[PDB]
Amino acid sequence: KTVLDANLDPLKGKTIGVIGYGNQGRVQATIMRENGLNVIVGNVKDKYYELAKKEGFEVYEIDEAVRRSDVALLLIPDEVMKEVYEKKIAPVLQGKKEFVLDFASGYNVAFGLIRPPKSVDTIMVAPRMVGEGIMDLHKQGKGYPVLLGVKQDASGKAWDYAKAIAKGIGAIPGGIAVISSFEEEALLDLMSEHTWVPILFGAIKACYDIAVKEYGVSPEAALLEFYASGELAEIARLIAEEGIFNQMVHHSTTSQYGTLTRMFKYYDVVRRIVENEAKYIWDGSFAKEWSLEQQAGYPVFYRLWELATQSEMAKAEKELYKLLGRKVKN
Amino acid sequence: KTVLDANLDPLKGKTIGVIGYGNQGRVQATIMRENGLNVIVGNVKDKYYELAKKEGFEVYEIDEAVRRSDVALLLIPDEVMKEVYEKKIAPVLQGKKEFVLDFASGYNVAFGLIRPPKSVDTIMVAPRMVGEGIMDLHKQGKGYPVLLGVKQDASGKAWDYAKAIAKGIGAIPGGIAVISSFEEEALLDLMSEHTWVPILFGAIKACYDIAVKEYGVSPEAALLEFYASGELAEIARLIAEEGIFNQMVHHSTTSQYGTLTRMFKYYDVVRRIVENEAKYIWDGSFAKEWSLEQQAGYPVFYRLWELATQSEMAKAEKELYKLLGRKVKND
Amino acid sequence: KTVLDANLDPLKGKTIGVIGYGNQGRVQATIMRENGLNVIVGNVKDKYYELAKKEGFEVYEIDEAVRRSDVALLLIPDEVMKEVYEKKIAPVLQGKKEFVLDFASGYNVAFGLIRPPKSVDTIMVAPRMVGEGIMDLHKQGKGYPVLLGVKQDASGKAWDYAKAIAKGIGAIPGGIAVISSFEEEALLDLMSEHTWVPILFGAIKACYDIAVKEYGVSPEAALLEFYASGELAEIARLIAEEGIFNQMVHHSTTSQYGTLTRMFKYYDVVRRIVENEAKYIWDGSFAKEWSLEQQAGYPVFYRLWELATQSEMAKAEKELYKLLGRKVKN
Amino acid sequence: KTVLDANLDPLKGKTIGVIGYGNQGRVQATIMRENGLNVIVGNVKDKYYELAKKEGFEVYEIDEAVRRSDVALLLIPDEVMKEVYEKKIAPVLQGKKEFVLDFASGYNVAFGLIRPPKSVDTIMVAPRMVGEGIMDLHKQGKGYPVLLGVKQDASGKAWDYAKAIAKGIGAIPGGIAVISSFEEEALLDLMSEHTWVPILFGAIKACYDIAVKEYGVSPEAALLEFYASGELAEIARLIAEEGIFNQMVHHSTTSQYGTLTRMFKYYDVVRRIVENEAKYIWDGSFAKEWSLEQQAGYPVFYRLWELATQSEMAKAEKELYKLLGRKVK
Ligand SMILES: NC(=O)C1=CN([C@@H]2O[C@H](COP(=O)(O)OP(=O)(O)OC[C@H]3O[C@@H](n4cnc5c(N)ncnc54)[C@H](O)[C@@H]3O)[C@@H](O)[C@H]2O)C=CC1
Ligand SMILES: NC(=O)C1=CN([C@@H]2O[C@H](COP(=O)(O)OP(=O)(O)OC[C@H]3O[C@@H](n4cnc5c(N)ncnc54)[C@H](O)[C@@H]3O)[C@@H](O)[C@H]2O)C=CC1
Ligand SMILES: NC(=O)C1=CN([C@@H]2O[C@H](COP(=O)(O)OP(=O)(O)OC[C@H]3O[C@@H](n4cnc5c(N)ncnc54)[C@H](O)[C@@H]3O)[C@@H](O)[C@H]2O)C=CC1
Ligand SMILES: NC(=O)C1=CN([C@@H]2O[C@H](COP(=O)(O)OP(=O)(O)OC[C@H]3O[C@@H](n4cnc5c(N)ncnc54)[C@H](O)[C@@H]3O)[C@@H](O)[C@H]2O)C=CC1
Ligand SMILES: O=C(O)C1(C(=O)O)CC1
Ligand SMILES: O=C(O)C1(C(=O)O)CC1
Ligand SMILES: O=C(O)C1(C(=O)O)CC1
Ligand SMILES: O=C(O)C1(C(=O)O)CC1
Ligand SMILES: [Mg+2]
Ligand SMILES: [Mg+2]
Ligand SMILES: [Mg+2]
Ligand SMILES: [Mg+2]
Ligand SMILES: [Mg+2]
Ligand SMILES: [Mg+2]
Ligand SMILES: [Mg+2]
Ligand SMILES: [Mg+2]
Ligand SMILES: [Mg+2]
Ligand SMILES: [Mg+2]
Ligand SMILES: [Mg+2]
Ligand SMILES: [Mg+2]
């Protein structure tokens, strides 16, 4: 069902050479060392190689690490990890007896872009926070939830390495850790980025556009109600803590009837959408969709940014942020 | 028109360089030696160089090969020729007077991925066997048919090279050799892979799925009728010698009427399909479809294999193969 | 479940009457006399009267036969069995204490065209082979699978007689034997004759027709690729032992992506075509659909044969068989 | 390409044992005797029997006929011919080595309901007339057209027997005879009975029904213009003689433009129809459609007759025929 803790046996004697010192590269670093592990760190000699050395991690080059450690936490992007894996690590992978390879998210594994040896223990360890607030909870010794699983194993005890890191990063005890597979992680992390999020923006991008152009509302008026307030975020504290559906008591009845009746009116209008995009991911199209834009130079990515920023809404909103006293993007 | 045989004049005095020694390697290789020609062979040093070494071919690398021969039999995949042709051969092609390129199939030529010199003759030589069974028919004398044609020539003495290599490969005499172009072969070799083959699988992947989940058949029951028996492959022999439509006498009348009526009921449902996929090939979309997923790292290819093997059908069929005593894969 | 073997008790102390000696006659005939049982055989005097008792099996007429046996293996067509059952056997059926009545396939039972007495042991024993090769499976000792079941019983041991006859036919042991009902047999044997087979022909009858009349291929060219070769041998024999899907390894990658992507494209296009036909069988229409044509002298059957043989394809393919030296229709 | 005549060689030294003496019975019978051929005749004993014998035919029973004749003109219906062919003729068919078998129309052959030996000469001889007027075309000597062909031969000269009978029936010389096969005959004879004829009736059954109920015309008024006059049948003679499209010259211009423009307006509305019915015949359904109705006792056939006769149109038309002084049914 769900795990709460495990023995912390294996990794006392084996070394862990971490790769990357990004956002997650700074949260896992602090914890495993502060829970009983000798560790070195990996990052190419740019600005980041000088900082985490000030954390006492005797940082070397990337390939210096995997040639020492039986583990490597590849806390680096899900996009350029391809480039690394075939210049450096694969010539290093085949030249090894045993190795335990872990990732954060599996946009590259689940969609088949990585096929490591059968001499390697494959696992996943997914934090479920943006990366900043996690440091408010670790100081509190507070666990937090993680997703796990396996793609490939040749050891029998591949899971305890994950359950070890499941206690190595301090995410448990206090929280929980889910058993799963790689497919069921990348599916969700992208489903948020396809179906429920962007529709939130379109409605806010349409209701405003529908108010001014058609129904005559002034631009400065509307945005104070839709999202320029903190209600759309201050609501989220209730959801994470007081629950989704009990949240509606804190708005009066006249908002409930208007909201619940429509939630079921326009339910089948969006389940039809989600059935398409998920099937557009289970097949791996979104990887072949993205992985060619990279091989063209981000044309569309450039344009749509050149529209939404230069759209009608941010125009009038930039005057608001110019008028509430906050910053103004160059 | 359909030819049977020709003179075997030109290649007496020109060395037969050969590239690749794969499945079609051993097909054409020991026939040109057997029917009286000199050969050097091309391949890249790996396990296939071993069995290639055991057969008396005096083998060099590829660049040294074409620097000797006026002909070449590029019996290598239809996918990595692009890699080879621009590293090795093209710097050698422009440094060659006259040369005659032969291929198996033209997925790369017909779709324009290869632009050889004007100083070169171009031909196609396609067998229509899988590759294994030729030495059951070859030593037996009864040959097998081939397809031919031209894309580009600057010689006027072109077709005899193909008709020469046609005897170089032993598929003639006894068999035949069809006159055609590059387009009309690569069109067909994929039309099988798009329209009539996969629909065969879907129906078998639906009728089973429709029997169990809706009509209550046990899974171990059905598969013994659909394809796991000697019903399907055993009748391919009747179609090969006794003819397609005369095959149906060997099933009684109650099976005939149910089949012929539906063959014409659901004909316009599939011609409707085939009109689309062929036009999706005549234009070259399928090459621009394949050419990119290569340049992404086989994402979709990985997934569908990760579905059909992990689907419902193979699961219960893997238990069957675990139960008839035959092999079952380590995966 | 998949039963493998049983005691062979019941069929000792009787005589095994058998009706019909067609293809499946000599299949089962050879084995009951081989595996230690007494037999008389039933067939109505024609050429088959020659070869049947020429192999030793004593013969009386059918009415002279079923009166001797408690069992009977009606290995005759699924079409004219109606004619026999009401002239001869039914006047003989009522004149029995017990009786055991077995068939090969149940196009006549499951669709209600036979309703035997109350004291008959009704069973099914279905081979799943064409009939010829069974001696290539038999003398190697390897069994092969059979389908079974019951419709109407008044004896308590309706299944042991089937399991008894199951060992009387040589298909077990070594192979298997499935428990089922009559409905689940005729459903499949006809579904192959309705959905996946004829579509195989139409595509081959369309792609060729579409190549020549629209895309300019010469007729002698195409057929050498589609089906005029024995390529279908070396693709489905792989399916017989090397598996449906693992056979794709023996075709290169470019033939896979073109095939698997389309198998899922045109899946829902054919599941419709199956659902409409199976429901046309579960209701019993196809038995009525045949049964009236039989009562009109095979008009349509005569015509479609006068089309498919006189079509464009055989008009050209016959000249190829006229040209490879293989047999032409004599 | 078309034939006009042949040598009259084969049928000398034989006897032509005819079966049936119906409407076409007296068509072919009178002529074969009166152009130099010996004949016996076949018909099962009813009122029709002795009238042929009253005209000199040495008649016997049916099965008597075939054993005296290498030929058999089966001038009988296309429906009960099945009943005969398996009770009587099939036990008799193998009595001959060579035997010749001729029909009028092939609703039973082309749709596969007959499969004779491979030692029998199979042919078709189709007159194209009702049967009454042939003895107006005959005495004047002017021939008339026929359709021919073969289904099965085991003799090498299956055609001169047809070209022989082609002079046995007198339809040539003077006329023509077309080369064809069985399929291309039954296709046409039924296509007339499916597409162009019944639509003629429906329009006449609708335009009237549309005039009275909707647009207010009286019933006695309209029918005098639509079909109760002999114009419509007199519109036909000009077609048979002066040709289809030159026929319209005898109607003034205001009727032409109203007719030609609509002939092309509502063309694809009926080609869309005909494509369905012919394919409903080429596959052989209409024989299976009919053949089962015979095996159910003509239920529908009874009803539609019980409707169209008891419809609104014949009701008011029967009063008109009751009013012009002609018959009343
Ligand atoms: N705070 C966040 O945004 C969270 C990130 N993740 C996961 O973290 C992983 C990466 O995210 P972050 O690094 O934390 O944020 P980030 O976007 O700031 O990543 C920057 C990192 O990329 C590294 N890098 C990229 N290419 C490199 C190359 N050729 N050589 C050396 N270093 C290279 C750099 O060292 C740098 O540290 C992803 O897989 C993601 O799934 C998961 C939860 C939230
Ligand atoms: N059953 C089949 O696969 C048949 C093959 N063909 C055609 O023959 C050609 C190739 O067929 P096969 O070689 O027999 O199949 P294959 O998949 O077994 O090819 C492997 C062979 O190609 C060579 N090779 C492979 N990759 C190479 C690379 N990167 N660099 C250098 N050499 C490499 C190797 O020497 C190896 O022996 C294709 O055009 C194919 O369409 C046509 C008839 C049947
Ligand atoms: N390859 C096959 O045909 C197989 C046959 N079966 C089943 O076996 C049964 C019949 O199969 P077969 O006899 O082998 O095929 P078949 O169509 O060749 O039947 C020939 C036999 O039927 C007998 N027969 C035919 N007409 C008869 C009649 N009017 N009166 C009396 N006897 C007549 C004859 O004695 C002859 O021996 C069916 O239930 C069929 O489903 C099942 C597995 C495969
Ligand atoms: N106006 C027409 O109906 C024409 C007739 N035909 C063809 O002539 C053939 C039959 O036409 P007709 O005989 O002239 O019309 P009919 O309907 O008047 O036939 C009645 C004749 O057929 C015989 N007969 C009827 N029922 C019989 C039965 N149960 N058993 C034995 N004999 C029976 C009788 O001797 C009787 O004289 C058909 O094949 C038809 O296609 C073709 C051209 C025109
Ligand atoms: O913010 C809301 O949702 C309000 C409501 O009750 O409708 C205005 C207070
Ligand atoms: O006659 C049939 O329907 C069978 C077939 O295999 O197609 C024997 C069962
Ligand atoms: O690789 C292919 O496409 C071939 C096939 O037969 O399917 C060999 C030609
Ligand atoms: O019969 C016709 O068609 C008439 C016309 O000229 O319109 C009335 C005479
Ligand atoms: Mg970088
Ligand atoms: Mg994501
Ligand atoms: Mg996420
Ligand atoms: Mg290689
Ligand atoms: Mg191909
Ligand atoms: Mg091929
Ligand atoms: Mg019989
Ligand atoms: Mg069947
Ligand atoms: Mg079957
Ligand atoms: Mg009568
Ligand atoms: Mg008619
Ligand atoms: Mg007519």
* Inter-chain contacts counted by CB atoms under 8 A, chains C and D: 38
CB contacts, 8 Å: B292 with chain A: 288, 292
CATH class of D1-180: alpha beta
Q: Where are the beta strands (DSSP E) in C60-136?
A: 73-74, 99-103, 120-127
The residues, any chain, with a CB within 8 Å of residue A118's CB and separated by 6 or more, are: A152, A154
Q: Cβ–Cβ contacts within 10 Å for residue A43, how many?
A: 26
Peptide bond connecting A299 to the previous residue in cis, omega within 30 degrees of 0: no
CB contacts, 8 Å: B330 with chain C: none
Taking only Cα atoms into account, the Rg of chain A, rounded to an integer number of angstroms, comes to: 23
Pair B123, B73: CB distance under 8 Å: no
Sheet holding C16-19, edge to edge: C39-42, C16-19, C73-74, C99-103, C120-127, C146-150, C177-178
Q: Which long-range contacts (CB under 8 A, 24 or more apart) does C163-166 make?
A: C163/C3, C163/C6, C164/C6, C164/C8, C164/C9, C164/C10, C164/C11, C165/C11, C165/C71, C165/C73, C165/C102, C165/C123, C165/C125, C166/C6, C166/C125
- Give the phi and the psi of residue C39 in degrees, each rounded to 5: -145, 140
Q: Which long-range contacts (CB under 8 A, 24 or more apart) does C324-330 make?
A: C324/B175, C324/B176, C326/B241, C327/B241, C327/B242, C329/B246
- Give the phi and the psi of residue A122 in degrees, each rounded to 5: -100, 135
| Residue A209 CB burial class (10 angstroms; 0-12, 13-18, ≥19) | middle
Question: How many Cα atoms are found within 13 Å in the side-chain-facing hemisphere of C177?
Answer: 25
CB contacts, 8 Å: C246 with chain B: 329
What subunits make at least 3 CB pairs under 8 angstroms with D?
C
Pair D218, D212: CB distance under 8 Å: yes
Concatenating the DSSP letter of every residue in C16-37 gives EEEE--SHHHHHHHHHHTTTT-
Q: Which long-range contacts (CB under 8 A, 24 or more apart) does A235-243 make?
A: none
Is ligand 3 within 6 A of the CB of residue C159?
A: no
Pair D75, D49: CB distance under 8 Å: no
Is ligand 6 within 6 A of the CB of residue C189?
A: yes
The residues that bridge with C125 in the sheet, in sequence order, are: C148
Distance (Å) from the alpha carbon of D291 to chain C's nearest alpha carbon: 6
Residues belonging to chain A: 330
Concatenating the DSSP letter of every residue in C167-210 gives HHTS--SSS-EE---SHHHHHHHHHIIIIIHHHHHHHHHHHHHH
Q: What is the DSSP letter of B40?
A: E
The residues, any chain, with a CB within 8 Å of residue D7's CB and separated by 6 or more, are: D160, D163
Pair B101, B121: CB distance under 8 Å: yes
Q: Cβ–Cβ contacts within 10 Å for residue A86, how many?
A: 12
* Ligand 3 geometric centre to CA of C214 (Å): 44
* Number of the ligand 8 atom closest to the C-alpha atom of D255: 7
Q: Where are the beta strands (DSSP E) in chain A?
A: 16-19, 39-42, 71-73, 99-103, 120-124, 126-127, 146-147, 177-178
Q: Which residue, among A33, A42, A114, has the nearest Cα to A76 in the 3D structure?
A: A42
Distance (Å) from the alpha carbon of B145 to chain C's nearest alpha carbon: 7
Helix D25-33 × helix D158-168 angle, to 10°: 90
Going from N- to C-terminal start, the domains of chain D cover 1-180, 181-329
Angle value at C-alpha A134, between A128 and A135, nearest 5 degrees: 165
Among protein residues, the one with the nearest Cα to ligand 5's atom 7 is A255
C187 touches chain B (CB under 8 A): yes
Q: Which residue, among A319, A194, D141, C200, has the nearest Cα to B196 in the 3D structure?
A: C200
How determined? cryo-EM
Q: How far is CA D57 from the centre of its chain?
A: 25
CB contact under 8 A, A288 and B303: no
Q: For an interface test with D, give the residue of C291, C292, C302 to mutate (most D CBs within 10 A).
A: C302
CB contacts, 8 Å: D82 with chain C: 297
Is ligand 5 within 6 A of the CB of residue A192?
A: no
Q: Which residue, among C59, C115, C120, C62, has the nearest Cα to C93 in the 3D structure?
A: C120
| Residue C221 CB burial class (10 angstroms; 0-12, 13-18, ≥19) | buried
Pair B100, B156: CB distance under 8 Å: no
Among protein residues, the one with the nearest Cα to ligand 7's atom 5 is B189
| Residue D163 CB burial class (10 angstroms; 0-12, 13-18, ≥19) | buried
Residue D166: enclosing H or E segment and its boundaries?
Answer: helix D158-168
CB contact under 8 A, B205 and C324: no
Q: What region, left, alpha or beta, does residue A111 occupy, with left being phi > 0 and alpha being psi -120 to 50 degrees? A: alpha
- What tokens does D214 get? 């909707």
The three-state DSSP-derived secondary structure of A193-248 is: HHHHHHHHHHHHHHHHHHHHHCCCCCHHHHHHHHCCCCHHHHHHHHHHHHCCHHHH
The residues, any chain, with a CB within 8 Å of residue A41's CB and separated by 6 or more, are: A17, A18, A21, A25, A29, A52, A53, A55, A57, A58, A59, A65
CA distances (Å), origin C41, targets C13, C15, C60:
17, 10, 7
| Tokens 């002939």 belong to residue | D263
Rounded distance between C-alpha atoms, residue B231 and residue C132, angstroms = 11
- What tokens does D55 get? 């005209």
Taking only Cα atoms into account, the Rg of chain C, rounded to an integer number of angstroms, comes to: 23
Distance (Å) from the alpha carbon of C183 to chain B's nearest alpha carbon: 9
Q: Where are the alpha helices (DSSP H) in chain B?
A: 23-34, 47-53, 62-66, 81-84, 90-93, 134-137, 159-168, 183-191, 197-215, 219-226, 232-241, 253-265, 268-282, 285-294, 299-308, 312-321
The residues that bridge with B178 in the sheet, in sequence order, are: B147
Pair A148, A104: CB distance under 8 Å: no
Chain B residues 247-306 with a CB less than 8 Å from chain C: 250-264, 266-267, 269-271, 273-275, 277-278, 282, 286, 290, 293, 300-301, 304-305
- What tokens does D285 get? 């359904």
Q: How far is CA B267 from the centre of its chain?
A: 27
* Ligand 1 geometric centre to CA of A155 (Å): 29
Rounded distance between C-alpha atoms, residue B331 and residue B316, angstroms = 14
Residue D120: enclosing H or E segment and its boundaries?
Answer: strand D120-124
The residues, any chain, with a CB within 8 Å of residue B147's CB and separated by 6 or more, are: B124, B125, B126, B128, B177, B178, B180, B185, C221, C224
- What tokens does B128 get? 């229509």
At what resolution in Å was this solved? 3.4
The residues, any chain, with a CB within 8 Å of residue C277's CB and separated by 6 or more, are: B262, C191, C194, C195
Is ligand 6 within 6 A of the CB of residue B250?
A: no
- Give the phi and the psi of residue B9 in degrees, each rounded to 5: -80, -55
CB contacts, 8 Å: B314 with chain C: 243-245
Rounded distance between C-alpha atoms, residue C172 and residue C286, angstroms = 33
CB contacts, 8 Å: C315 with chain B: none
Taking only Cα atoms into account, the Rg of chain B, rounded to an integer number of angstroms, comes to: 23
Q: Cβ–Cβ contacts within 10 Å for residue D81, how many?
A: 20
Rounded distance between C-alpha atoms, residue B93 and residue D263, angstroms = 68
Q: Where are the beta strands (DSSP E) in D182-282?
A: none
Q: Which residue, among B37, B43, B46, has the nearest Cα to B71 in the 3D structure?
A: B37
Q: Which residues surround ligand 10, an ion (CB under 5 A)?
A: A 189-190
Rounded distance between C-alpha atoms, residue A114 and residue B210, angstroms = 36
CB contact under 8 A, C253 and B79: yes
Q: How far is CA B17 from the centre of its chain?
A: 22
- What tokens does C316 get? 């050209």
Nearest Cβ partner for B203 among C195, C218, C221 = C195
Angle value at C-alpha C195, between B219 and B242, nearest 5 degrees: 105
Rounded distance between C-alpha atoms, residue A101 and residue B141, angstroms = 57
Nearest Cβ partner for A111 among B292, B295, B303 = B303
Pair C109, C88: CB distance under 8 Å: no
Rounded distance between C-alpha atoms, residue B307 and residue B315, angstroms = 11
Rounded distance between C-alpha atoms, residue C123 and residue A318, angstroms = 83
Rounded distance between C-alpha atoms, residue C173 and residue C167, angstroms = 7
Q: Which residue, among D195, D219, D192, D196, has the nearest Cα to D207 in the 3D structure?
A: D219
Residue D44: nearest ligand to its CA?
4
Rounded distance between C-alpha atoms, residue C24 and residue C22, angstroms = 6
Residues belonging to chain B: 331
- Give the phi and the psi of residue D123 in degrees, each rounded to 5: -150, 170
Q: What is the DSSP letter of D309?
A: T
Q: For an interface test with B, give the residue of A85, A286, A288 to mutate (most B CBs within 10 A).
A: A288
Query: In this structure, which amino acid lies at residue C146?
Result: V
